[PDB]
Amino acid sequence: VSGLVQQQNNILRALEATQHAVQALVWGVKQLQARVLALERYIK
Amino acid sequence: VSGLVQQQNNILRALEATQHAVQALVWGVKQLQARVLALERYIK
Amino acid sequence: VSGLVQQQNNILRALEATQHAVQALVWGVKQLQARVLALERYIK
Numbered sequence: 001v002s003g004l005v006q007q008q009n010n011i012l013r014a015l016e017a018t019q020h021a022v023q024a025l026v027w028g029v030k031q032l033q034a035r036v037l038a039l040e041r042y043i044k
Numbered sequence: 045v046s047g048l049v050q051q052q053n054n055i056l057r058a059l060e061a062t063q064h065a066v067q068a069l070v071w072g073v074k075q076l077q078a079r080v081l082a083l084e085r086y087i088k
Numbered sequence: 089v090s091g092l093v094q095q096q097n098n099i100l101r102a103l104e105a106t107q108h109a110v111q112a113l114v115w116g117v118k119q120l121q122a123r124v125l126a127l128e129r130y131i132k
Binding site for chain 1: 092099100103106107110111113114117120121124127128131
């Protein structure tokens with residue numbers, strides 16, 4: 001690619017990489033939520 | 045819409061979706077940080 | 089600056105800021121994983 005097409009393509013690839021990283025953060029936060037809830041339930 | 049406006053709107057919608065997920069994750073991490081700190085303060 | 093170069097520079101500055109935010113949150117979730125693991129290991 002080249003020109004505007006290369007510039008748009010770089011932006012889209014970087015968005016896709018950020019999207020994959022965000023999806024993994026969502027599931028790391030939900031796995032934490034479950035481990036923290038288990039600790040809270042145990043202490044109670 | 046089509047052509048460059050369609051392509052630029054697809055990029056802006058994807059960037060906005062990623063920004064919204066980061067703002068929801070910032071709140072979920074603040075809530076987990078407070079819950080983890082309360083567990084650590086109880087245990088100590 | 090104006091036209092397409094202004095629109096593209098605005099998208100690039102916003103995408104860069106979102107990528108920085110996601111990398112900070114990847115480290116913050118790993119810090120909370122370590123804290124939660126310490127709590128689990130002690131309780132066990």
